[PDB]
Every structure is written in C-alpha cells, then in structure tokens.
Design a protein around this ligand. Structure first.
Ligand code: ADP
Ligand code: ADP
Ligand code: ADP
Ligand code: MG
Ligand code: MG
Ligand code: MG
Lengths: 526, 526, 526
C-alpha cells in the first residue's frame, strides 16, 4: 500500500497530546454563561459563528498527522456525545482531554495502560451509578424552561417558547426548528396532516371567506394513479352522496372527464367534493399517500402489487376525517380515524428507517411530521438580523430542545458541573484490584473537577478555588458563574439533564482511555 | 521494462533486516496481557486502534524499497498466520524476525543458506511433532472459556459469552460477530431459516398479536419464476386444502390473479396460506431457493434445466416444515424435513466453495448461516461507546472465536511462550547432517525462547531471566505476566490452542528461512 | 526520428561490458547446490525470490542505456535458453559473459571480430559434436529421478514425485504443475477426457453412492447446437435402445421437450441416458466438441459448414467410449475409440497452433490436456506455507520437469560442468584458418572452464584449483560441490541433460560473439 512512517512511545504520545490539547483549547472557550464564540471560515460563504463544542471540533483538522490523530479522536468523542444526547459537547471534550493528559502522564515502563483503562471504566460505571441516584425526574414545567434556558446560554425567551411548544405539542411530541424571516422568534403550531398542494379548480370553493374549501366529517379517496376517468370515480361519488358526507380526493392528478364530472356536480345540485394533486414526487408520493391512508383509515388505490381498483370501492376502502381545509396552496386534513396501533407502528417504522439511512434526503422527517401531526407539531422560526446570527441562535435552540428532551426522558441533576463533583466520594469508596486500576480511578477523580473549574475559568475567576469552595460547601449549593457568586443551584435554576452528563463522561472516558493505551502510531507520509 | 537498481550481499541484507526489525518492533508491543495498542491513521475516517499483530503489519509499508521488501515478507507471515488460524499473529511476527536476524547473522563465505533452511525446517517439523505430543484435546467447556478469555486479552465476559454461544449452538456450529448499538455485548440466537422478506399482503396475518402469520406442520412451495397466473397456482392450493395443512409460498414474486385467489381464499374459506417474495438478488436467489428446497425437503419450480412446471405438483414436490413465522419484514421457517445427508452435502459444498476465490461478496456466508440454522446460529453484537472501541473489541472477539475453534478442532497446549519452550529438548535429540543444518537447528532453538521473552518484556520485567527460570522449573509451571508471578499454567487458565502455535511457527520459519537465502536484491528506482 | 547519441569503440564496449558484467554478476550467485537466491521487487505485490537465472535476468533493466544494451542482450541469451530447453539458464548467462569479456579484450586494430566470431562458432560446433559423442541415452528410471533431483537443487522428493508421474503417465506424456493449498506436494493423475460440466438432471443418476451416473461401453452424441427439440433427439434414442447401449449426450444445452423425453424414458422404462452441457465458451466449445468427436470416433452435429442434422443419424455418426462417469460438477469419458492417426494428427495441429499463437489465452493447453495421452495427464500440486515459497519451489520443479524431458529426448552427460570441460581436447585438435579464428577458439577454450569454476566459487572454495584438479583427474570423476569433495559423477548421480548443455552454450556464444563485433553503438537521449 501507501508508503508510511511510524513513531514510538512518549514522543508520539506527546504529539497526539499536542493535537488533543490544541483542539480542546479551541473548544473550551465556549463553555458556560461567560463562555465565548468561535468563528470558522466557510469555503464558499460567509464564516460560521458558533458556541457549539462539537461544531468547533469538527472544523479542526491538522497538518501534523499525529496531532491530527489526536484531533480526530477528540472530535470523535464530541460527535458521539452530540449524536447520543445533543448537548454536553464542550464538556465531553474537556473531559476527554483531561483523561488523555492525566492518562498519558501516568504511563511508565511497569504500567499497564489497558488495565488502567479497566480502572477508568470501573470509575465511570461507579460515577454514573451515583449520578442516577442524584437524578430527580422533572415535574413542573418551570423546570423545563430552566433546563432550556441554561442550555440556551441564558436566553429566557428561548426556554419560554420551548416550554410553550412542549406544553401545546407534548413532552414527547414533535418540535422542529428552522429559519424565520421575522427579526423575532415565532412559535407556529400545526395540527392535522398538512401538505403543500391545493385544489385543482377554484370552483370547489365553498366559504368565499378566505377562499377555502372547508369540510367536516368527510371521506377521503386515495389514488396512486392519475384519474383521467374511465368513470372509475362515479361509484366513489355515488357512495359519498349516498351517506351524505363530503369527499376529498387525493391523486397523482385529477384530470379529463373526471374533473368535469366533479365541477359539474359541484356547481350544480351543490355536491360537496374537493380534489387535490398528490403531495409528490415520484416514489416519495407513494409513501406519503400510504401514510395518509393508514392515518385517515381506508386504502390506497392504483398499482402496488395487489391492485385495488377505483371501479370497485367500498366505504371501508376510503378514509374518515374529522375536518378538512384546503386552499390554492396547501391542504390540511384533521382528526383522521384509523388504527392508532397501526399509526404508532408506522411512525416506529419511519424512525427506524431514517435512523439507519444517511443521505441528507430530509423528506423522511417531512413524513414524520405529517403522520405525527394528529398530536401536533411545532415549528420554531428563529429570528435575528442576519444569517450567521440565525445559525448560531438556531444551534443554541436545537441544543436546548435536545436538552429538554433528555431531561424529560431521564432526569435532571445539578448544573455548574457540581453533579460530577458530588460523585467523587462514591469513587472514594471503591476497591481497586491493583495499582493500574487505582491510577485509573485517580484519573477520573481528577477529571471530575474539570467542567466546573473550566466554567469558572471562562468567567475570569480562580476556577480551582471555586471547585474546592464548592466541595467544602453543602450538596445543594454551587457557583453561579454568571452572577459571579455561590447560590442554591436548583433554586436558582442552574441544572443539567442527567443524560448529557452521563453521555459526555461515558463517551469521553470511553475513547480517551483507549487513546492512553497506545504505544506505536502509524501514519501516511506527506 | 522499468529501470532498476541492484544490491549485493550482507549490505542489502542489513537493509531488509532493518525493514523486518522496524515492522516487528511495531507489532511486538501488542503481545500479551500487558501488551499495548497501536493506532493507525485511516485515509478517510477516524484512526483505527488495534492489538492485532497482522493488522499492524499490513498497515506498514516503507519508502526505502529494500526495507519495504523485508516489511512485505513479514506482513506475508502475519497474514498467512491470520488466514490459517486467526490468532497467533504477533507471535508469528516476532518468531519470523528472530529467524531472520539469527539467520542473517550466521551466514558467511562457504555457508549454504539453502541447506541452513533445510535444517531449520527439520527443526520445525521436529518441534511440531513434540507439540502434538504435548497436545491435550479439549473436554470441559470451562477450557473453552479459558482459551477465549486469554485470546481476548483477559476479558472474562467475552469468553463467557463465547462459551454460552458455543454451548447453545454447538462446538462446530455457526457463530458470527457484529456491531451492537447497545453499550454492552449481546448474544442473540437464531433458529430456523430466517431471511429478510415479508408477506406481500397484510391480509395473510393470523395472530393480531405481533401482527404475524404463524403456522405449524406446514408445506412450502418454491418458485424460481413469478407467479401471476391462476393456472399454475390453483393445483398447489387444492393439494394443500386436501391434506388440511397451511401453505407458505416463496417466489420471485406472487402477484396478478394468483394473489387475488390467495387473499380471497384466505378471507373466505379461511384458508391457511401465506406468500412471500424470494430473498431476492439476481442469481443468488436461485441458490437460496435451492437451499430452502434441500432443507425443507422438496423441489424448486421454474427454469433451471429440468423445468418442473407449477401446474403439475405432487405432495413429494413441495416442502415440509415444523413451524413458520412471518412478519412485514422477515420470514422464519423452522424444523424443515429433508435428507440430512443431502443438507450436510449442501453445507460441505458451500464451505468448499467459500474456501476458494470468490472474494468478499460474503452472501456465500449468508447462505451458510441459513442452511446450518436448524442447529442454530449465534450473533455476537459487541457494544462499547464509540466506533473505534467497537472495532478493537470486535477484533479481539473474532480472535477469541477463531482461537476457540482451533482449540476444539485440534488440541490445546500450555499458554505463555511455554509451549514452544518445552519443545527445546526435542531439538537437543536431533542428528544434523552437516554444519549448515546444525546452524538452522540452533536458530530455531534460540527462536523458541522469543515469545515468552516478549510477553515478559512487555510486562516491564527481565524477560530472559523469566524464560530461564521457567526452563529450570517443571513442565506444568510457567509465568503469569499479568499477575506478575509463576504459577501452574493449565490450572490458572493460561493456555493456547496448538493449531495457532503450530501455524505461527510454521509460517514464520517458512518465510524467514527463505529470506535468509538471499544474496542479491533487485528493486525499482524511485 | 528521436534525437540520438552515439559512441565509438572500446569506450562504448567497456560500458556495454559493464552492463553485461552487472547482470551476469547478479545471475551467477544462484548457480549450483551452494548457490543462493535473488529477491526481486514486484510492483503490485510481495516480492519474488528465485534461483532461476532467466527470471533474474529479465528483471534487470538499467538506466545507463549502453549498459542496458548489454543487459538486454544477456537476458536475450537467458530467455532463448529457457525457451529452447527450460533449464541451463545461469550457465548460459555466465558463458555469455565469458565470451563477451574474452571477446572484447582480444580485439585490437588489426583484428577482425566478425572472423573471430566465425572462429568461436567453429569451436562451439566442434564442442557440441563431442558433447553428442559423450551423450549416453537415459535407461533406468533412477536416472530420471537423478536428473530431476539435481535440476531441482537437491530436493529428492521433487525428483521422486516427477519420477512417479513420468512413470504413471509415460516419458512423453503430459505433466503440468500448479499451486497446492496443502502444505505438501501432491501428485494427481487424471485419465480420460474430463471437463467441468455436470448432468442437467439429478434424475440421470445411476449409483446412489457418490451420486454419479456410471456407464460403460457407451455411445456419445455431440451437438454444437441446442437441443430444445423438435424431436431431432428421438432417432438418437431409438438407435441407442436398438443396440442396447447407454448414451451420453453433449450439447450447447439440452432442455425443452428433449429433456422431458430424456427423463421420462429414464424414469419409467429403464433407459440409460445422460445429457450434459457443452464445455462451453463461445467459439472455444466448438473446438472442444470437435476434439471429443475426433477422440471418441464420430461426428459433431449442427453448423460448421457442411451441416450434419440430428434427424438423420447413423451409429457411425455417434461416438464410442470404454467408460463414462458424470457428477453434478464434472464429466469424465474414458477409453474412447477413434483413429489414433487422426488424434495424434489433432495434437500435432494444436501444438503447432499454440506455438505460434502468442495470445496467452492459454486454454489451448486445456485443449491439449483434454485430448488425452498415453498414459494420461499428471497434475503437480506444489505445497509450502506461503505464496513466495510456492513460486520458488514451482520454478524449481518446472526446471526439473523440462530437464527430465530434455534428458529422455536427447541424452544425459556429466554434471558439475565437466561435460563442457571434457570437450576442450576436441578443441586442441582443431585447425584454425587464421589468427582471428584462433582467437575465437581460444575464447571458447577459456569459456568452457567457467561453469564448473563458478559452481565451486559459490561453494566458497578455490574454483580454479578445482577445475584444474578435475582436468588432471580421469574422465568419470568430477567435483561434488555440495558434499565438498571429488567423486565419480554418474555414480553419485550428478548429471545434466545434454540438450541444456548444448543450448546454453550455443545461444550464449551465438549472441555474445555477435556482441563482440560491435564498433559503434547508437542510443536514445534521456
Ligand atoms: N449561570 C451558570 N452558573 C453555573 N454554571 C452554568 C451557568 N450557566 C450554564 N452553566 C453550565 O454550563 C454548562 C453548559 O455549557 P455549554 O456552553 O452549553 O457547553 P456544552 O455544549 O458542553 O453544554 C452546563 O454544565 C451548565 O451547568
Ligand atoms: N497472563 C498471562 N501470562 C502469560 N502469558 C499470557 C497471559 N495472557 C496471555 N498470554 C499469552 O499471550 C499470547 C497471546 O498474545 P496476543 O497479543 O494474542 O498475540 P497474538 O495475536 O500473536 O496471539 C498467548 O500465547 C498467551 O499464552
Ligand atoms: N552436488 C553437486 N555437485 C556438483 N555440481 C552440481 C551439484 N548439484 C548441481 N550441480 C551442477 O549445477 C548446475 C545447475 O545449476 P542451476 O542453478 O540449475 O543453473 P541453471 O538454472 O542454469 O541450470 C548443473 O550443471 C549441475 O551439474
Ligand atoms: Mg450546551
Ligand atoms: Mg491473540
Ligand atoms: Mg537448474
């Protein structure tokens, strides 16, 4: 293969550690309320500004291949943490560096770094245990706004708006975040099954106020093929006029004589029908119409395999919806009836789809919003006066969102970094098997102090003074670095979801303790 | 052809030896419980971490073409050893370097390196004989867990889970290894003939609990062609309703009018049929349907050669299975009846296929799990908090698995480097034909000491003191380098499969003794 | 054309001689029992090691274009020798260098290098004459094993296995050599006409043991076209059931109604038929079916030109074979009856084809292997623990094979190099026409001493002492360089085929004596 070059021992370890230390030093300035932003040049456009540890970490590759190895591993931890939890990234980086440094330094000739890794992992199990003991599950929706506001770097309006969206859509409902055009944040809530397709003809309009087609207790007909009728529609219309309910028709298109029958029966003898084009496009539209089929009940017509033909319809082959509103641009269907079991099965199918599949073909999420819209969905249109502002802010909002979900699903624990600090005594009651493992437990014991000392150091204060003052102080009190003084933590609102504190530590220790095991490094020649 | 450059004798030999020594020095740090890991830069992704000798060896090519010649030969050794045995790679490397060095040093004028090669080969035959004498075939399934745990670098949970899988699937059954998404290891066991294809229609569902089609004592119909026509489907159903058993149908597809008959007779008579698509890849599906044919007892319809047509079926042309379960995604068939002779025939055929040169289109293994699945198969989903961890661990698990298979199929012998150490007296009772052969036997005699010296040296202790203390000590006792003291080897669980100890030595000596014969090296000019 | 640069006289001669001397010096280390190997870097893979003079010679091109001219001429010599004889390559190289040096040195102003060439050519004619006088044709098959073992550099097992294959296949039979996967050598012998195609239907099987169809005294039907019949098949069956003999059918394919007739007549009334696909590759299969036609006695049906149609058969248009065995994978036909004149005519045709057809679409040998000997064909599966070893050993066995064939077809003469040494007195009784020719005869006279002195020099001893000791000693005695002492040559088994000794010398002198005639050399600019 490619010509290569290799390096041995503490020299190579010092190189990789130089890379780790550089990347960590770049990431760590973002930490906490008094933390600061990092600008990253974009190749094509105007530069990014960010406070996100992981996005800083991903941006830094290094010319020196060994230092780049260190860097790659540290961004690996930060990325793993962002994927598994969505916050706690800077923390995962500073922990990873601490374990890597304190690890590397303790290595000698007699030492056994794999066994030291074993000791470290013992220490991490033991700490996350005590963390779970410390966790108190969230209750009041004030705590939600608190977790959001701290994860959003002190922006109260963010955690308020997140609290509102999470109330009105639910704690495990769908909230999504995107650019506003407004200079301010907006919360919009959609209910139903909305998609961007409108009536084919104006003649379908009934209300004259808004120019909408508005129906209730309606039927829905779903056709995967075009309907340029062979009069495959008429039984479907006779069945609708029979049970005196309005009919909405969704199809690849409604065309030719079909439409003529539709707006003749519409303009004359006032029949209640509307027809709209399928959401589109191509193979996606199949999945969408089958989604709406399963949600609203009934069955999709046209060729899948077993072909259900439009000539032979029955009322159990249509669909049933509480309400329908359609305009020139979009169509919304509301309170559609079908098997809820089948709906939760369906969303469980799409999430397990999207989760394994990775082309940034984001429509799989556009599916998920649609079929989950019968609880509701919230769109978070973030404001600001400029694209870069909008992107930084949106990074923070997404962080706070993921943080609130982690808080709701696992728990909350003390903020600042105190939650890890309180776990040290649990390490003090450990029973190491040998010197190596003892070294590992010592490494974790030192590493736990880091996040709090870093948040304080960013403030411009003597962080390690503050750590020890906190340790001397009672369990409920910690350091408010923004206010610049000690306070009850939970009362003042400084709290972190337990899941992120768990995952940052577990990932960071997980890769760094492996990094410390290295004795030989092999890299490509420039 | 290409312009070239040539070098003569011990000058060139010292260069090739420099390459050998570099690669060996890189590989050798991994050896034993106190061994250490090697990081390798990947071109596209985050870097590999490994303890595998062969994967370190393959990663190192060299700019200096002569040193690269040495390197290529040593990685040839490690790769051959990994292919033939699946462990014992680092050992093969350090052995190969020892034979290459001690070889090169002993050549002079008048010396006959070919004849010396003959002597070392004599010595290796003589060693492997005594190794086989030392071999004690495995008995208790504790010994399995011991071989696994030592080959997995002291991870007891690995050898436990391997012991469990090997118990529940059998010692020569199929175990495979794959990534978990879980942070912990999982053992899954599959029974049957599973493949990833589901019922064509929901209407086939029987239980409403799980939404499965569940059958017992059923027949199976196997069609290599599509089944659209009624004409070829109906007799197969009349014969099925005749003997009052459920029928599963596997086909390239089942569609047209056939499907309509299927879900009409399903919904009315309440006939017990299910239909599923063939596992489905071009020419592969033929081999799969032939597999299920042979397993379930019976024959495949459509065109091979002899075409048996679907219109003329007989009960002995179908298939017969104890149970069958189908879902939207997958189909499992269980306790299918056919000639065990013929299925063992099929498995003996596929292994002897796989054994040759169709490369890494590994569905050939996916076949083999299927037709061997009526004993069982085990999936080993290994955990960890990060991809690099998962890959290192999976390397170790695969090592331990191959090691356990080597143990069960051959014998087991003392661990550490002791198994080779005890063979030295067998060299002492040799009768060399001439000085050259005597030099060879001396080379092997020195080389046998090496693995123990390396395992001890990695521990941070005076390895060659330890070797001689071991030689002074009794046959049953050796050095526990992890615990840092001498112990009975077999009692403490430190044991190596004889196959790997045999293959490492045979390959290493095999290539290195050839390397020492070189007098002139010819390389391309830069 | 391309810009060029030219050089005049002994200056340029010294450069070309530098190239010759370099390549020769590289080649000559391989010579004799105490000879040594040469490693050659491969562009794509792991490096070759070889003891083959020609493979060393072809590997060396040179940057200096004049030296490269010399090198190209010497590798021309070694290649010509390898093509014409298959051994004696190193010898041809050192001879060529000796003639080139001794040639170049003796030229002056008054000298006439063309006439000197005439003199050396006289001397070599006179030498090969006396060589043919010395030749004693091979008799005992011990001598075969001796020639093989010596040409294989002392590996007795090689010459044993070659002796066995040559006994069991005949002295002018077909032996071929290829890689084993086994660690040891294997001799396999195939008899018949085997090819890799199996019965179209399992129903054709006769013996439940092995699952074969076994026939004797059978007919053969050969169809170049498909038999989807049309029932052009039936007369061929009526004619077979008439004379109560089994029928094997070879065709492009046999299927449609034909196959149905075949397996109905097989499964009900106990008719003895099999049908198998043509060996099958486009235009190749045509030639193969014509081969089997000619061997089994009878004719191929379908389109050549004159079309013989399947409807009009006669028993003399079929084929007749002593025995036939068919399986799922392969078909073997044995003791087929036809004109031996016509078959040897056919073999004489294909050899004269392949010989001119520099195509490396080498299946023409697969043809030659198919149209079988007398006594059969032998496959030599060479073992070893590694690919490079296998390539070395296979090079040596190919050498020994070619050497044994040269021995049986021309003769054997004294080994060591003595055979050329004994020819010197024949030169002493020559009658040179002029000084130039006398110089030529002197050149050959010195050159004859070289191979023996070189084999001794590789041993580490005073080669030129040994040559003169040999010359003072009797005709039957020479130097055993492996045992390191003088012995009866033929008695100790050290012998060389006369053909290789002839061809090495003739080629070497042939090219080198032309090289010495040069006065100006013209080369391209870098
Ligand atoms: N006023 C505050 N006082 C003390 N700690 C705070 C305060 N505000 C935020 N933090 C801490 O800052 C950390 C979050 O830092 P942040 O910049 O979001 O990095 P990350 O991306 O790792 O979450 C949390 O652990 C939280 O406890
Ligand atoms: N505690 C121990 N004491 C002594 N030898 C050990 C111990 N653990 C493992 N070994 C030895 O280490 C060797 C395995 O080393 P390993 O890193 O797997 O190299 P390889 O990949 O070449 O097998 C085995 O020969 C085993 O006997
Ligand atoms: N034991 C021996 N004693 C003396 N000469 C030997 C012995 N073994 C081989 N030879 C000589 O070595 C020569 C063969 O050398 P080899 O390496 O095969 O060169 P080539 O490839 O040109 O044939 C033969 O001429 C043979 O006589
Ligand atoms: Mg954050
Ligand atoms: Mg191992
Ligand atoms: Mg030879």
């Amino acid at each position: 293969g490619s010509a290569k070059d290799v390096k041995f021992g503490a020299d190579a370890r010092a190189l990789m550690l130089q890379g780790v230390d550089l990347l960590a030093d770049a990431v760590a300035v973002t930490m906490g309320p008094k933390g600061r932003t990092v600008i990253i040049e974009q190749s094509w456009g105007s530069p990014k500004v960010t406070k996100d540890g992981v996005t800083v970490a991903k941006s830094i590759d290094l010319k020196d291949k060994y230092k780049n190895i260190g860097a790659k591993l540290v961004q690996d931890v930060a990325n793993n943490t962002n994927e598994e939890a969505g916050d706690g990234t800077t923390t995962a980086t500073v922990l990873a560096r601490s374990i890597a440094k304190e690890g590397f330094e303790k290595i000698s000739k007699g030492a056994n770094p794999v066994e030291i890794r074993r000791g470290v992992m013992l220490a991490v199990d033991a700490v996350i245990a005590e963390l779970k003991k410390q966790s108190k599950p969230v209750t009041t929706p004030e705590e939600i706004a608190q977790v959001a506001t701290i994860s959003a770097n002190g922006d109260k309006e963010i955690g308020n708006i997140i609290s509102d969206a999470m109330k009105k859509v639910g704690r495990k409902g769908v909230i999504t975040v995107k650019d506003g055009k407004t200079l301010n944040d907006e919360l919009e809530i959609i209910e139903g099954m909305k998609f961007d397709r409108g009536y084919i003809s104006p003649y379908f309009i009934n209300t004259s106020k808004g120019q909408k087609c508005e129906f209730q207790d309606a039927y829905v007909l779903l056709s995967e093929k075009k309907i340029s009728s062979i009069q495959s529609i008429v039984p479907a219309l006779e069945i609708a006029n029979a049970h005196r309910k309005p009919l909405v028709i969704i199809a690849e298109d409604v065309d030719g004589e079909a439409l003529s029958t539709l707006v003749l029966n519409r303009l004359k003898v006032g029949l209640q029908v509307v027809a709209v084009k399928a959401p589109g496009f191509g193979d996606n539209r199949k999945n969408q119409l089958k989604d709406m089929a399963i949600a609203t009940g009934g069955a999709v017509f046209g060729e899948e395999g077993l072909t259900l033909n439009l000539e032979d319809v029955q009322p159990h082959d249509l669909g049933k919806v509480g309400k329908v509103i359609v305009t020139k641009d979009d169509a919304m269907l509301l309170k559609g009836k079908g098997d809820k079991a089948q709906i939760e099965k369906r969303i469980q199918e799409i999430i397990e789809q999207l989760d394994v599949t990775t082309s940034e073909y984001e429509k799989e999420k556009l599916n998920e919003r649609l079929a989950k819209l019968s609880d509701g969905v919230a769109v978070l249109k973030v404001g600001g006066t400029s694209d870069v502002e909008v992107n930084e802010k949106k990074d923070r909002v997404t962080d706070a969102l993921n943080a609130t979900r982690a808080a709701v699903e696992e728990g909350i624990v003390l903020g600042g970094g105190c939650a890890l600090l309180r776990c040290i005594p649990a390490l003090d009651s450990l029973t190491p098997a040998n010197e190596d493992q003892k070294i590992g437990i010592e490494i974790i014991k030192r590493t736990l102090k880091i996040p709090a000392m870093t948040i304080a150091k960013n403030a411009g204060v003597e962080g390690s003074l503050i750590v020890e003052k906190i340790m001397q102080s009672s369990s409920e009190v910690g350091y408010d670095a923004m206010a610049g003084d000690f306070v009850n933590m939970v009362e003042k609102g400084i709290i972190d979801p337990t899941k992120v504190v768990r995952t940052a530590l577990l990932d960071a220790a997980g890769v760094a303790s492996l990094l410390t095991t290295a004795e030989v490094v092999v890299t490509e020649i420039p």
